[PDB]
C-alpha cells in the first residue's frame, strides 16, 4: 500500500533502463555517481543507459571477506547529473520483510510493480554455479528480464533482483557499507 | 497509493489468466459466472482458464446501438464457484481519472502492476481495421500480452485494456448497464 507508493517515487527519481553486451537491466543509482548492477550484467568500459550512451569510470565485483560472491557490481558513471543519495534507505544488515514490492524498469517490462509478498534470509545458494551470499527470497513465479529488480518495502530498499528458478526469485541485499 | 492496495486485493478475488486459440489473456468475473474478455480474444465452447479446461455457455460480443464496436467479449463460464459480484465498482458512464492503475495477471506476466496515470475519454478509435468507441486513453509504453488488464483507480474499476500503438493504451469503459 504505502510500499507501491514508496517504489514508484524511487523508480521514478533513481532507476533507469540499462542495456550491456549481456542484456537488459533495471539499474538503481544511490548516491553521486555510483549504480547497481546484478553482477551478470558485465558492464564493459560504456554501457547504454536510458537509450544513451554512457562511459563507465569505475566498476567493483563484490565479494565478502572469504571472496565468495555477493551478485553485485558497482559502478561509477560518466554523466553530469547526480543520483539522489538514498544511502539511508540501505539497511546495514539483512532486512526480513512481510509484504515487499519488486519493481522493474525495462523495454521487456517498461515501470511494472510485483506484490512479491514474504522476503527471507535465505543465505547461501549455488546461483548459475556460482555459490552466493546474502541473499533474500520470495516466491516469485519469475522470469528473465527482471534482474535488476529492485525490492522494497516501505521506507526500506532491500536488494536488487539477481535471480530464480522459476518459483522463487533472490534479491542480493544492498547493505549501506558497500557504499562508504 | 490507496489505488495500488485496491487493485491487488481486487486481481487476487476476481481476476484469472485465460488462455484461447488467439492467446493469453487477463479476465475479470464481474458476477455469478459472467466474466468480461477483450473482443479480439474470441473465445470458443472452451476456454483454460488458470491452466484448466473450462466451457462456455454463453457469450455476447459487446456492441451500441448503432452496432459499432465495444471490443468486448461476455462470457458465461460452465463452473460452480460464483464470483464477487463487483458490479457497485463500475460506472454508468466513461469515467476520467488522474491516476489509474493497469493490472495484468497473465504468465508471460505474472501479477504486474503499472501505474498509467492521466486516463483520458478518447471516444472514437479505429483499432485493428474496427472502428471502435467508449475508449479510455493513457500514455503507456505498451506491448502485447496485456491484452485483458484491468484499469483502475481508488474504488473504481474503470475498463479492461483492448489495445495501444506503442505508445498509447486504450482500454474498454466496463460500464455497470452491461452487466443487467
Known amino acids: 500500500g504505502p510500499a507501491f507508493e514508496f517504489a514508484?517515487?524511487?523508480?521514478?527519481r533513481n532507476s533507469s533502463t540499462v542495456k550491456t553486451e549481456y542484456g537488459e537491466f533495471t539499474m538503481l543509482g544511490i548516491y553521486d555517481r555510483w549504480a547497481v548492477l546484478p553482477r551478470h550484467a558485465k558492464p564493459?568500459?560504456?554501457?547504454?543507459?536510458?537509450?544513451?550512451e554512457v562511459g563507465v569510470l569505475d566498476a567493483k565485483e563484490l565479494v565478502d571477506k572469504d571472496g565468495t560472491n555477493l551478485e553485485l557490481t558497482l559502478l561509477k558513471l560518466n554523466r553530469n547529473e547526480k543520483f539522489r543519495?538514498?544511502?539511508?534507505?540501505?539497511?546495514?544488515?539483512?532486512?526480513?520483510?512481510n509484504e515487499a514490492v519488486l519493481a522493474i524498469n525495462t523495454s521487456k517490462f517498461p515501470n511494472?510493480?510485483?506484490?512479491?509478498?514474504?522476503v527471507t534470509e535465505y543465505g547461501f545458494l549455488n546461483l548459475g554455479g556460482t555459490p552466493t551470499k546474502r541473499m533474500l527470497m520470495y516466491n516469485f513465479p519469475t522470469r528473465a528480464?527482471?534482474?535488476?529488480?529492485?525490492?522494497?518495502?516501505?521506507?526500506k530498499v532491500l536488494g536488487i533482483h539477481?535471480?530464480?528458478?522459476?518459483?522463487?526469485?533472490?534479491?542480493a541485499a544492498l547493505l549501506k557499507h558497500y557504499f562508504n
Open 8 to 12: 514508484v517515487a524511487m523508480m521514478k
Open 44 to 52: 564493459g568500459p560504456t554501457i547504454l543507459m536510458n537509450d544513451q
Open 85 to 97: 543519495d538514498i544511502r539511508g534507505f540501505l539497511a546495514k544488515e539483512e532486512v526480513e520483510v
Open 112 to 118: 511494472m510493480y510485483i506484490p512479491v509478498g514474504q
Open 145 to 155: 528480464g527482471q534482474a535488476g529488480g529492485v525490492l522494497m518495502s516501505t521506507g
Open 162 to 171: 539477481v535471480g530464480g528458478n522459476g518459483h522463487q526469485g533472490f534479491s
